[PDB]
Every structure is written in structure tokens, then in C-alpha cells.
Amino acid sequence: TVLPFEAMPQHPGNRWLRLLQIWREQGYEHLHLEMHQTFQELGPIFRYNLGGPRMVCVMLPEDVEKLQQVDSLHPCRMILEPWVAYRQHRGHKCGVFLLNGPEWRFNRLRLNPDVLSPKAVQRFLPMVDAVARDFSQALKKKVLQNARGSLTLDVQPSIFHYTIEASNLALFGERLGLVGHSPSSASLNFLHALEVMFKSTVQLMFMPRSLSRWISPKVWKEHFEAWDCIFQYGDNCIQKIYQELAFNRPQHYTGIVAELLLKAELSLEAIKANSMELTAGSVDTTAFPLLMTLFELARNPDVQQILRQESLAAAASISEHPQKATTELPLLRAALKETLRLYPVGLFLERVVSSDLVLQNYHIPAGTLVQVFLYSLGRNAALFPRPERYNPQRWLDNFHHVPFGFGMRQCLGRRLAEAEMLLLLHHVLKHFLVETLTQEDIKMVYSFILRPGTSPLLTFRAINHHHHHH
Amino acid sequence: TVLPFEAMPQHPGNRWLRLLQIWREQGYEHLHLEMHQTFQELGPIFRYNLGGPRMVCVMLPEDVEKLQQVDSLHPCRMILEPWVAYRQHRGHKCGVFLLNGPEWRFNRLRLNPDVLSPKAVQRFLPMVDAVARDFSQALKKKVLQNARGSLTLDVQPSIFHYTIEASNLALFGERLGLVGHSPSSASLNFLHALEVMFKSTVQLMFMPRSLSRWISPKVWKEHFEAWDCIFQYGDNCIQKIYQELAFNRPQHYTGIVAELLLKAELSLEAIKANSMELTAGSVDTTAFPLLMTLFELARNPDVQQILRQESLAAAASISEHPQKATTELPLLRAALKETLRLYPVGLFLERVVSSDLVLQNYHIPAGTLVQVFLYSLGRNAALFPRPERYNPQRWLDFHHVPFGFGMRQCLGRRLAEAEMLLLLHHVLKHFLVETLTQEDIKMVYSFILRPGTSPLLTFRAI
Ligand code: HEM
Ligand code: HEM
Ligand SMILES: C[C@]12CC[C@H]3[C@@H](CCC4=CC(=O)CC[C@@]43C)[C@@H]1CC[C@@H]2C(=O)CO
Ligand SMILES: C[C@]12CC[C@H]3[C@@H](CCC4=CC(=O)CC[C@@]43C)[C@@H]1CC[C@@H]2C(=O)CO
């Protein structure tokens, strides 16, 4: 009664034809649209002619729920070779994202309490909030210098500097001075290295190393250089804290990586490695969903008014105890789910499943690469009535919200990312109206992360006309 | 009783690794060895994965005999895309090698009588004989100036110029003056261009234009430039003969191309296209086996004597009538067959078959590309006892298919054999040929199969 694997419809692509297109185009910007169309054509599940091993593409919660059941003690993902290649080339340990098996669980169990748990959030949220305030304040100052009490900009650079600053405070306990000031040359280089790293990832990611070694030798060279610059940026941060904590163990909280070095449950190389993942990880992944949310508010001003109404009503509580924003801004929290439904930074969830199972009435063998395309998932009209509509209310009225993945491998940085996102939006909403003429869809572009190919011109208009009061 | 097509064993590799390998290596020099060890391993027949299109590889006479029986009235080979693309880019017509169908046959039928018929041969062979006599006489003059009455050299340059000179006289009635003299800048440019054309052909024939068009745009530019140089050489030859004939029609034989022009059974554009195939196709194809024959004679001094004695015996009659060379040197003719068994200039015959057939008890559907690999065919120790032995005698008695078969068999075969034969004849009469370099020469595939090195040969005057 259950259909066999080969009964499953097939993506009509040769791994080779896409291999060669990636070599030619130096990327794969339209992946999300290719998969989306393929589900449009073949229905909610299909397989892909991969270089041997089975691979299946799904888009329904049902399938995620099932997929979580099959998570062993050690859930597993496809090795990301270019990234792992770098660590081995320079002698570095791999952090959680690149670890599988017991080394992974061991790390993860020693990182959850200080990065993801609610006790941790209670401690870093006020640090984030200070940065969120300083962003708004800086922007309001520029706004009130203008005769019309507004500023019209590409907000992207300043949002990226916001996430570098908020993350570095939460992770290392240091203010970099990047909010309300110009980018440092270190921050610009870091941003560029991340972008080159991500792009070159897409180029090396869809072929085996044996082939790419001689087909794309200078893409490897590019990718390692990018990593080298990312690693220098992170090692600078680690050296400063490590020397500081060698001489004085503070009595109070000074961030997430301090908790890890004080406890010293993980080894130094293991802390270094996980700290690089948190530093590299905390910039683009949070920045683009913020930009997208600003964009959707800008062109859904009625939804914007509702969210402001809420944020104005909680201003007093959140001024007094910043932690209360997590519970007192449910509609804004819901807006974020809405942004990640439409614009999922992580395009697909992925497991190399360790046991036979059944998705969609098809038999899925042990060792099958299963991928969950969140882009299509979020646009299923039967589960998301009017999926084109940006409607945060839809979450107030289970496995529908899974942009951070699921289970024990669920995003380690979820609560930091949410904190950063929510608090910046909260303070912006209290002080500014946000507007655009660009009322039409921003094309998303896939380059390991899913990101806008365009930044809209947004206008921030002071409601009040006072630098502090909202 | 008939195994269906997919029963048949399968080459391990895939066409994408292949083309990437070629993009990286800038060639495919081992194609012969690879296919050979594939035959050992998988048997006397296998299919290659073209991902839909059907391709079979074979190595047995048995299989060639039935490949011919399924020759139509219009036997088809695969579109050699790089070569046809040059013709299109410059506005030229295709000659017989690149034609299929009724147009192929219309050209071919008007080409055989003057290019390949025994009557054609008797007219051009004495010309070829004059050039081959100049070769040995030039060499004898140099050889005798040395105190040990011998010259040791790499002969490849001079032999290539011989074939240029011999083909040109036979084809156009012109002596270029390249035998017993220096290469000219035209001849060296010609040889260089031919070498780049062949190399670049290998770089393009193994992928669709739609991939090579951006995988290898520089290789396309290289290819067409080589062709330009080749067409310029050939066009100079054509413009000359064309002008001479417009002013005076000979009453005597002045070569192959003249007969085509005088008869005007084919169009001007058609004569030109075929004249370029002949001109471009009569240098490297003939020169390499000639070298390999020189080399194998040097290795096997016992077989060289037998051939010498034959040529000394027939010298007088051949000087009287050079046309008797065909009939009076049966051992030297056999020699050539033996050179071509071991060192086939063209590595595979090819037919895109037009009816269904069966080979090795497999069903082979219409539209399949059947390739016969002559390098392996010739080394079947089961069919040529002591396969590495250079033995002309085994040909005195469908094993001899290095010029292919059917209506499509090599159009230049008699001109090629005549050039090879006469040169060896005049050399054997006057010199012993020797080397210390006894080891097998590695062959290399760049569209023509050819020696990768050139052994140093000593010519000692008798
Ligand atoms: C909105 C922003 C973010 C999104 C949408 C996101 C999404 C994801 C997703 C889908 C996964 C895979 C989960 C799974 O396989 O179940 C993941 C893993 C991970 N994320 Fe995030 N993430 C974000 C922000 C961050 C930040 C800021 C950090 C660093 C502080 C971070 C660190 C990580 C790490 C270390 C993992 C690996 C988890 C493991 O293997 O144990 N993420 N994230
Ligand atoms: C010993 C030297 C040569 C060898 C081994 C050789 C071999 C071949 C082979 C194997 C073919 C394919 C035949 C088939 O598919 O049945 C061929 C075709 C052809 N050869 Fe040669 N060839 C040689 C010399 C020449 C020369 C000197 C010329 C021109 C002067 C020439 C002109 C051609 C032409 C025009 C074709 C195409 C015939 C057609 O498709 O109708 N060949 N040759
Ligand atoms: C989100 C993501 C997994 C988590 C990473 C993120 C890119 C930034 C990043 C860098 C790290 O060193 C740690 C993991 C991480 C935060 C990836 C981009 C796409 C990928 C996925 O979507 C897998 O589901
Ligand atoms: C011999 C050959 C077919 C005939 C051509 C030859 C290469 C040189 C050449 C150029 C021409 O303009 C006419 C045909 C020809 C003489 C080819 C090299 C390999 C190929 C084959 O192996 C046929 O199967």
C-alpha cells in the first residue's frame, strides 16, 4: 500500500547540466524559483537524480514533523565540504554547524545553556536593547537635521552595522562603535569577506572536491582568502577576551563567549571554533530578515500602524525592563514569522536520514538526503490562505513556523537573532513612520543565504520631532 | 536468441568527465590505449553512454563485414561539427568527407574516376615517381659527403615535405621545389596550421557546440584560424591552375584537379571544396605511416633485406615504366598493410547505421553510431598470430580495412599508396636504414593517430 521510492516523480535535471551552469554563471541565484516551479509542476514531493545517493525534496509541515521523529540522538547533515576543507587546511576544530556525531552533541550540550536558553537571553537582551536604542537615536538625530523631519536612505549598511554591533556586544561584551558612526575599515572588510565566502560556497558546493580542485582552482583560492579574513576578524575578538579573562573573572555578566571561557567545559580550540561560527553567523542571517521586515512594513502601512500601536502601548514596560519585549510584543514577534515565511534566510532544512521512513506515502530509505524547501512551504496557499499577503495576525488565529529548523539541531542563535530583530523594530516603530514608493516585490537571490537582490529606498519620518521622546 | 541493445556491456566512464578531462588536458592523446583496454576488459563489443543516443564500439572483421552489408546507397558518418562550422562561417561548400546523402554521392561519383581509379593511377604515378627519385638522390648527395658514407638524422621534416611535394604535383601539376631544398615559409605555415587544426579538432568534437561555444571559445578561434591558413594555401593552388586552364587546355595529363576542371561535371564551388579536402588530406595522413614504415624496417633488418632484394630486382622495369611499381613490388605493398595494421592513421571507422542489424548477437537499432576501432582490431593476437611482429608476409594470400570500406572507402588510397610505395622503393635501392632506438614508439591521438616521438635514423649508402 506504501509506494516504492522510484514511484516518486523526478526533477528533470542532470546534476551535470546544473554543475556546468554554475561554472558558467558562477552562482545559482534562481535555485529557489527552480524548486518552487518543480513543486508547482510535480506536486509537494519529488526526487533528484544526484551523483548516486537518493535525494528528496519536500514542502509540507507533515514532512518536517515526520522528519523530526526520525532524528536520532545525533541528527546529521550533508558535509559542507568547502567550509570543512578550510578548517582542516588551517588545523582548526569545527564548531557545531560543521560537526556530526558525538563530537557535535558534546559541543551542542555545552553551548545551549549560554547561547540559546532562556536564562542566557535574560542576561544579553539588555545589552542588545542598548544597541537598538542607540540605532534609533542616531537615526533620529540625522532625521531632525532635515527640514521635513525625515531621512530617505538605503538602510542596508546601517542595519548590517547594527547586527555586527549588537552581536559583538552580546558575544564578547564590547562596543565596536559602529552604530551612529561610520563603518570601520575592519567592519567593511569583514562584510565583504562574508559575501565573497557565501558566493564561493555556492560555486564549490554542488560538485565534489575531486572535480572542483582542477575545474575551479581559483574559486578555492577565493574561498580560503575570504575565510582567512573572517577568521582574522574572529581571532582578533577572541584574543582580546581571552587575555582579559586570564587576569580577571568578572562577577557580573559580560556576554556569551565569556560564560563559555569562564566555565571552561569546552577546550580552548573548541571555544575558538564555536565562537567563529557565532561571529560569522550573526551578521547576514539577521540583517536580511530585518531589511525585509522594514520593506514589508513600508508597503503595508496599515499593518505598520497596528504594530506601532502595540509598541507605543508597551514602551513604558520595556523601558523599565527590556526583557519584557519577548512577551509584550506578540504582534511584532508574529511579523517576524511572517517575514521568514516569505523570505527564509535559510532556503532549505536538510537531513541525511539515518533510518527508513515514509513521507507522502513514499518509502524513504536509510541514507537518503531529505531537503525541505521553506520558500515553497511558506507559499502553500492551502496552509497559508493568501500567501502573498503580509499578515502577522495569521499566527495569532503547529510545524508551520520552522525557519530556524527543528529538534536538537535547531538554530543555536535563534534567540539572539530574534532579540536583535525585535528590539531594533520596536524602537524604530516608536519613533518613525517608514515609507516607500517601491511598492513592488523585491526579487530574492540565493547565494547560500537567501537575500534580496535589491535594497529599496526607505523614508524614516519622525512622528514626534524630538531626539529622545517618541 | 538476440540479446537486446542494453544487455551489451557498458564503458565505465561518462561524457561529462570526458569533456572536462579534455578541457583540462587540452587533448585526448590516450584515446587509443583507453579503448583498447576497454575491449580487453569488457569484450569485443560495448556501448557508450551518450544519455539517449546509441553508440556501439567494435573491433572484429566479422562485425565490419556486417557493418558494410547494412551500408545504404548513402552511407552516413557523424557530423564533424567543427569542420562543417568553418565551411558555414566562410561561405564554402562541403567536400565529400563532410557530405551525407545524395549530395555526397553526386560528388563522390564524379570524384572516383580521376582521384582513385586505376586509370587515374597510371596517369599520376609517374609524376609521384619523379619526386620520390629526387628525394633519394638529394639524400644520397648529402650521405656521400660524409666519410662513413651515411647520414644520421631525424627524417620527419624531409618526409613531410616529400608528401607535400608529391601530393601537389599529382594534384595540381606543380613542382613546389621542396625536395632536396629548404622548407618554404608557406610549407612550414601549412604544416603548423594542419597540426593546430587537428589538435583543436579533438578539443571540439567531443562536446556540443552549445557547450564548447563558452567552455572553449578560444579553441574555436584557434580552429578557424588554422583553417584560414589551410584554405589560403589551397586557394593559392586553385587560383593558379584555374587561370592556366582558362587560357589553355592541355592535351596531356597535368594532374588530378585539372581533369575535374576540364570535365566541369561538378560546380566550381564543388571542385574547390574537394580540392581542399585532397590538399589538406594528403600531407599528414601519408607522411606518418611512411615514417612508421621507415622505423619498422630499421627495427627488422631481416625484413628490410627481403624488401631491398625485391626492389633491386624490379628497379630496371620500374625505371622503364614506373606504373609497374604497383604490380612488381608485392612485398612492399604488403609492408604498408602491416604498417597500417599496427599504426592506423585513422583510429576508428564510423557509420550511423540506417537499418537495424545484429552484432555479437546483440540487436542494434537503426540510427545507432557504430564505431570500428582499428588499433585493437589489428592487435587481435587471435587473428594476427604474434601481433607485435612486423611481418609483411601475412598479406600475400576484411582484415585490411585501414582505408575503411564500401562506396565511402578512402578516396585518396591509391594516391597515398603510390606516394608511400615509390618513396620506400627509391630509398631501399640506395640505402640501408638503421637505429639504436629499438623500443616501441608511443602513438598519440590528435584526430589522426601519430607517433609521439621521431627516432633518429641512419641511412647508409649501398
Ligand atoms: C533569522 C536569523 C537566522 C535564521 C533564519 C537561522 C536559521 C538556521 C537554520 C534553518 C538552521 C538549521 C537548523 C536545523 O538543521 O534544524 C540553523 C543552524 C544554526 N544557526 Fe542559525 N539562523 C539564524 C541566525 C543565527 C545566528 C545569529 C547564529 C549565531 C549566533 C546562528 C547560528 C547557528 C548555528 C551555530 C547553527 C547550527 C546548529 C547545530 O548544528 O547544532 N543562527 N540556523
Ligand atoms: C595512408 C593514408 C590514409 C589513410 C590510412 C586514410 C584513411 C581513410 C579512412 C579510414 C577513411 C574513412 C573511410 C570510410 O569511412 O570507409 C578515409 C576517407 C577519406 N580519405 Fe583517406 N586516408 C589516407 C590518405 C588519404 C589521402 C592522401 C587523401 C586525399 C588525397 C585521403 C582522402 C580521403 C577522403 C576525401 C575521404 C572521405 C571519403 C568519403 O567519405 O567518401 N585519404 N581515409
Ligand atoms: C542558515 C544556514 C545554516 C546556519 C549558518 C548559515 C550561514 C551563517 C552561518 C555561519 C556559521 O558559521 C554557523 C552557521 C550559520 C548561522 C546558513 C545559511 C544557510 C543554512 C541553512 O539554511 C541550513 O538549513
Ligand atoms: C582518416 C580520417 C578521415 C579522412 C580525413 C582524415 C584527416 C585528414 C583529412 C582531411 C580532409 O580534408 C579529407 C579527409 C581526411 C584525409 C581523417 C583522420 C581520421 C579519420 C578517420 O579515421 C576516418 O574513420
List, in order of start, the domains of chain A with CATH numbers. 1-470 (1.10.630.10)
Q: For ligand 1, is residue A403 a contact (CB within 6 Å)?
A: yes
Residue with the nearest Cα to atom 5 of ligand 2? Answer: B345
Asked if A215's CB is within 8 angstroms of B24's CB, the reply is: yes
What is the H or E stretch that residue A407 is in?
none
Q: Is A78 helix (H, G, I), strand (E, B) or coil?
A: coil
Which chain A positions have a beta carbon within 8 Å of B16's beta carbon? 16, 19-20
d(CA B430, CA B308): 9
Report the 10 Å Cβ neighbour count for B386. 9
Å from CA of A49 to ligand 1 middle: 28
**Cα separation values, A343 from A289, A351, A418, B114, Å:** 7, 21, 15, 75
Alpha helices, DSSP H only, in B216-299?
Answer: 217-247, 256-263, 268-280, 284-299
**Alpha-carbon distance A248 to nearest alpha carbon in chain B (angstroms):** 58
Residue with the nearest Cα to atom 8 of ligand 4? Answer: B281
Q: For ligand 2, is residue B415 a contact (CB within 6 Å)?
A: yes
| Contacts with A10 (C-beta within 8 Å, 6 or more apart), sequence order | A42, A46, A47, A48, A49
Contact B310/B329 with Cβ under 8 angstroms? yes
Of the candidates A371, A397, A365, which has an alpha carbon nearest to the alpha carbon of residue A384?
A397
**Cα separation values, A37 from A47, A54, A337, A345, Å:** 14, 21, 23, 19
Of the candidates B347, B351, B346, which has an alpha carbon nearest to the alpha carbon of residue B413?
B346
Rounded to 5 degrees, what angle do the CA atoms A47, B18, B88 make?
Answer: 105
Q: Which atom of ligand 2 is nearest to the CA of B406?
A: 16
What is the H or E stretch that residue B343 is in?
none
Phi, psi of B27 (to 5 degrees): 170, -170
Amino acid at the residue A112: N
A106: cell is: 558534546
Q: Which of B275, B282, B343, B345 to mutate to test the pocket of ligand 4 (most atoms within 8 A of CB)?
A: B345
**Cα separation values, B415 from A263, A344, A447, B96, B261, Å:** 90, 72, 62, 16, 19
d(CA B47, CA B24): 25
Contact B317/B328 with Cβ under 8 angstroms? yes
d(CA A36, CA A379): 9
* Nearest Cβ partner for A20 among B24, B51, B211: B211
Å from CA of B413 to ligand 2 middle: 6
Report how many Cβ contacts below 8 Å link chain A to chain B: 11
- Resolution of the entry in angstroms: 2.5
Contact A287/A455 with Cβ under 8 angstroms? no
Closest-approach residue (CA) in chain B for A25: B214
Q: What is the largest CA-CA distance in chain A?
A: 72
A420: cell is: 536583535
Asked if B24's CB is within 8 angstroms of A214's CB, the reply is: yes
d(CA B165, CA B176): 6
Closest-approach residue (CA) in chain A for B211: A20
Q: For ligand 3, is residue A349 a contact (CB within 6 Å)?
A: yes
Phi, psi of B246 (to 5 degrees): -60, -30
A118: cell is: 532562556
Q: Compute the residue count for chain A.
A: 470
Of the candidates B131, B141, B405, which has an alpha carbon nearest to the alpha carbon of residue B282?
B131
A315: cell is: 514602551
Query: In angstroms, what is the C-alpha Rg of chain A?
Result: 22
Which chain B positions have a beta carbon within 8 Å of A21's beta carbon? none
Q: For ligand 2, is residue B405 a contact (CB within 6 Å)?
A: yes
Q: For ligand 4, is residue B134 a contact (CB within 6 Å)?
A: no
B447: cell is: 584526430
| Contacts with B385 (C-beta within 8 Å, 6 or more apart), sequence order | none
Return the sign of the alpha-carbon dihedral for residues B374, B375, B378, B382: negative
d(CA B236, CA B187): 12
Report the 10 Å Cβ neighbour count for A443. 11
Buried b (16+ CB within 10 A) or exposed e, A393-423: ebbeeebeebbbbbebbebbbebbbbbbbbb
Q: A190: annotated binding-site residue?
A: no
**Alpha-carbon distance B23 to nearest alpha carbon in chain A (angstroms):** 9
d(CA A49, CA A54): 8
d(CA A404, CA B437): 72
d(CA A96, CA A266): 12
**Alpha-carbon distance B18 to nearest alpha carbon in chain A (angstroms):** 12
Question: A210: exposed, middle or buried (C-beta count within 10 Å: 0-12, 13-18, 19+)?
Answer: exposed
Contact A180/A137 with Cβ under 8 angstroms? yes
Q: A94: annotated binding-site residue?
A: no
Long-range contacts of B104-110 (CB under 8 A, 24+ apart): B104/B74, B105/B73, B105/B74, B105/B407, B106/B266, B107/B266, B107/B270, B107/B274, B108/B407, B108/B408, B108/B411, B110/B260, B110/B263, B110/B265, B110/B266
Å from CA of B277 to ligand 4 middle: 9
Beta strand A55-58 pairing with A45-48: antiparallel
d(CA A209, CA B405): 46
